[model samples]
Target: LIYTAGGYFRQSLSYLEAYNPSDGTWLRLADLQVPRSGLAGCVVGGLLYAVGGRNNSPDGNTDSSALDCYNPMTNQWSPCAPMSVPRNRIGVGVIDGHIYAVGGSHGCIHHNSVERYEPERDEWHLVAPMLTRRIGVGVAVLNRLLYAVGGFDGTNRLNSAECYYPERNEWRMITAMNTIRSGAGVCVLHNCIYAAGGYDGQDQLNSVERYDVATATWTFVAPMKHRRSALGITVHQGRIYVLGGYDGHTFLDSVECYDPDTDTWSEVTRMTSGRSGVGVAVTMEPSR
Candidate 1:
């Protein structure tokens, strides 16, 4: 199942939608329990979990601590333990069956706080905080570690990166990104983490880069066709899909795909409508 949810068009939305690649069709599922924008979602053990985002409209001051999960098998949503604090532009990822909520904003200020949820207990627990206070950080699970990449720290757009080791219960700084960015779409494909288009403080960016885990270094990759920030990214069939996001002037519906094998990017089918700050994920059915 490929899923996307909560984004701003004219206003914040709760539209929980799914796409089936086999049929090339979209089906609207149950709406979010609390409509929000800037939220993040990830699949853990076959269930979709929605984490922190703002409850009001895009320009509103309200942020949310709500953590809700959806079961595709049941077509129902359930509330889980909320975060310790409200946030938006948060980073959410699943590692070894547990969900981790990383740095984001509480109003305008960024946070270094980190929290983890254990599905077996349906509860959240505080974890070692990130080394830097930031929002819009690109997060993904790479080789069992939760990595927090480029983001904005109130004063400046950041290029610094860090990773959390669950077994060690600690965070350590890693090689920084080549370009400073925030709100970029990030995903792991073939053991490498890719950072796509994002805001570089002055303007939206079309640049892309990849971090090789084995070498602990970053290298430039083929750029996307359009400049974007706040886009949705997911890996499907060995390609990375960059979905709807905003450029400086308008929200975008254009989609781009990257094939690492060829080190190239190409435009693909566009979304039905433009959106920004939406969640994206691809899930596979579990074996019986």
Candidate 2:
């Protein structure tokens, strides 16, 4: 099953929606306790976690330090331990049994700080910071190391990539991508990391790249039909799925999937509403 949660359509949303692969339909689940945009969704031990984002307000957009968990069995959402520092447009990745929250910004102040969460302990603690502060970074785990992909570092839309060495608690530079990308969708498939569309400071992008650590190289791949950024992406059943993002002019609800075997992308059901910073996670069927 694939699930999507709160994001910015016009402002932060409280909607929690799921797509049932068996029936090929979308189901509405409980709303998030707090509305969030620019959040990241990750599944740890069968529970979906919604992390750091900003909640919209008439006062102004406020970044959040909130974390919430959803239990499919009960179809319920519950609050969890939030981050030490508030962040939106953060990068989140799970390693082993732990989840790490990477760089992001509160509003204008970007971050290089990283933090780890232990589900068993229900606690969060600081970790090694990134060499360059980033917002809208794409994070993927491969070979047990966390890779931080392209994102805006306050001024520049960056192409530089790096990976975190948990053993050393250090981040080391890797090969740069072919073009600058902020808010690109990234995931791992067949041992290679795939990065899809994002903004390049000037234009919303539709370009894509495939990178592997074995050769430390990034090879271009098939682009998506739409120019999008700040979209949600994940690998499921041997395919890459990107959902709901900004295309420069408008927020989107369209869903697209890529098949590596065919080297192509095809459209899926458009979501009920447009969202740019939505949180998407792929979960396994619940055990009986």
Candidate 3:
């Protein structure tokens, strides 16, 4: 799997790597456009697209500029247009050739806004904003629809979830989670939305939740043994892999997996570094 080292600090954009889950290995890849953290990235048409994060300016190392887009294939980073408003702690996913850039905070305030990207045309379009302005949330695509899950909304942590349709450019609320958390990781598999470790103000979360996109309902599932926030999640080999995230005070190197059929959580080999908020994308070979 390919991923970027995620965070919202001075050194967030410097490192990216590809991991082979089968054997637990890491190979360094190209760097980002600038030093960015709290980033969200997704792959579309063989290129990895990274969007919104708190980052230092090209001249200084104090804050972010909402820089977007990085292509690994050519080892080149191009600045596609920026978001409608500058933000960090963003959430993202790709659907039907369009990239959905979701909620994030703009310094003191969190934003509920959503945007879509068209690389072929080099354009960014605004969509309906989210129900709340929260940074560090998790997002995923299922059934051609986008789901925005939990995040911190400045004053308080949020437990809300909502779905958006690009076709209609509208958003509707969905079943909320049992906990108010942010910086979680999300992935869709077998028609279920799996949300893993995140923060709930007081502590990092180990609990994992599943939402049945078909029925628009949620059900509690097995939890990760370790509490974490700002995690990177992806699925491979019929298994769900949860990568590096924060365990409250310290970063984590641990990795875990959950099987859809078995409905259980188990440990996997550790990642090379302790990271949270990294971006990820995957491509599968034709079935045998």
Candidate 4:
């Protein structure tokens, strides 16, 4: 099952949308305990976890350190321990049962700081910060290392990429992407990390690129059919599925999948509505 949820607004941010691939169906699940957009989500031990985003309230846009968990059996969303700092447009990845929240921002206050969440303790611990602060970043796990991909670093749309070594509690900068990007969709497939479209400071991008571990290099790949930023991406059944995002002009409701072997992208289906800053995660089988 590939579960998709949230978007750019406050009023419609809490209702969870669960999607299955067979017929491109959707099932709205329990609403999030705290309503927010730009949250990062992933499945942990059969449960869905949402973390770090911004909520629009009376005070204008407020960043959040909120953490919420969804239990499928009960179909209830329970608030969990929050992060040490508020973050929006956050990047998150899971490794060895621990979830790592990477760079994000609080409007003008962008972040390079990171935190690790321990499910058993329901606690968050600050980890080493990235060399450069990032907002709207995308994260993926490659060879047991968590890689922080392109995003804005407070000043500019960054092309920089880096990876964290959990054992050493350190991060080392990797080769940068071909273009400056913020809010790109990133996923690791066939041992390589693929970064799809995002805003490139001036315009939303339709370009795609990848980084390989063994070669320690960045390579240009086939571009997407449409320009997108803040998109939802995940690898399901060996293909990279990229869902709706912003195109600078308007939000997009299209969903497309890329096949690594053929280096091509194809329009697959559509979400109920256009969305940006969406979260996509592939979890256990529906019957599980």
Candidate 5:
């Protein structure tokens, strides 16, 4: 099952849309407890968790610390413990049953703070902060380490990247991306991290790049057809799926897929409508 939820359409939204690749169909699921945009999400222990985003109210421009979890079996959402700090445009990754919430912004303030969430205890704890303060950061786990990619840090769009070590509870800078970006999509494939399209300060970008973990290097890859920012990305069936995002002129409904083996990108089916600030996750289930 591939699930994507909670993003800005006309306004912040609560609905979830799920794709069943086996049947080639899509179904709308239950709504979220809070409609939000700029949230981050990931699956841990078969449960989908949504974290920190802003609401639609006039006074709700500030970030949210609310954490919500969804169970596919029940098709329902429930509240979990809130994060220590309010955030939007956060990056999330899960490891060893714990979820890590990386850098993001709270209103006009960018943050370098990192927090780890424990589901069993329903608690969040502050961990080592990233070296750079940024919002719209891209995070993904590779070989048990979490990498925080390029993002905006209030002053400038950044190309810097760093990694967090759990055992040492420390963060260290790594090779920077070739292009400065914010709100990019990142995922790990074949032990390499792929950083895709985003806003590069002056313009939305279609450029894509990959980071090699072993070599500590960054390299350019095949770019996407449409320039985008704040997109939803996930890996399924060995292909990297890039979903709806803002393309400067308007919100986008176009989707694309990248095949690392072929080193190329191809168009995939579009979403029903344009979206940005959305969250995406992929889960493997037993075949019927």
Candidate 6:
């Protein structure tokens, strides 16, 4: 099972859940420790981590250092350590046993701050910041290296990308994406990095791009059937599932899944309500 939360006017408020592959199930789990939208979330070591979102107005994005961890087994949520600096529109991923929260915005200011969380210690320690500050970027772990993809920097939408090496605690530049975008979703499939639909601040996109971790290059893949931003994405049964997001003026409840083997996309049933700025995570099926 996977959980998705966030979207719409309730963004800085409450969250709603959508269970995929089930076709028609919604479960309300524990609310976020903070009411924020455009946040980052991922599952690591059987725990769900939510990080960096805002509680202000449109464009009132905050650099929240807030970190919350949820244990599905117990249906409980507790505070983890917060980032050294607060940020929304960040990218989050887990490598080895540590959680990395990367990039984001502060007021009109954009940042490249990278922070790591150690659950056992209940504390956060800063890692080297990005070479550039970005918001709405997507993160993926391939071959033990963390990839930070496209995002915005207050003034322009971006195509620039980077990677982080945990061993040296350092960041290095990577090839820029073909499309300059923000608010995108990223995941690892068969050791390849897949970057899906997002907004360019000017237009919502349905295009997809993949980064080959081995060769360190990107290839254009099939575009999604719908366009969304601040979206939530995950992988299940070898398929990539893109959850709710906005088209531009209106929020969306539409869901789509992509099968890389066929290089095609199929729309699943719509969501319960239109939503944007959502989060998603998939858990292993429990043993009967």
| RMSD for each of the candidates | 2.3, 1.5, 3.2, 1.7, 1.8, 2.5
Pairwise lDDT winner, candidates 2 and 4: 2
Ordered from best to worst lDDT, the candidate numbers read 2, 5, 1, 4, 6, 3
Clashing pairs in 5: none
lDDT of 5 at 173: 91
Which structure among the candidates has the greatest lDDT? 2
TM-score of 3: 0.90
lDDT of 3 by residue, 2-104 (tens): 4554453325656666777765777666666576777777777766667777665456543343545555555556777777776678888889888888888
> Which candidate ranks first by TM-score, i.e. highest?
2
Candidate 5 lDDT tens digits, 197-273? 98888899999999987788899999999999999898888889888899888888777889888988887677777
Deviating ranges (above 4 Å) for candidate 6:
16-18, 57-63, 284-288
Give, for candidate 4, the lowest lDDT window spanning 10 residues.
6-15
**Local accuracy by lDDT, each model:** 0.86, 0.89, 0.76, 0.86, 0.87, 0.79
Using lDDT as the yardstick, the better of models 1 and 4 is 1
Candidate 5 whole-model C-alpha lDDT, 0 to 1: 0.87
* TM-score head-to-head 5 vs 6, winner: 5
Q: In candidate 3, residue 60 scores what lDDT?
A: 58
Q: Which residue runs of candidate 2 sit more than 4 Å off their true CA positions?
A: 284-288
Runs in model 1 lying further than 4 Å from the true structure: 58-60, 284-288
Which segments of model 5 are wrong by more than 4 Å? 58-60, 284-288
Candidate 1: residue pairs that collide: none
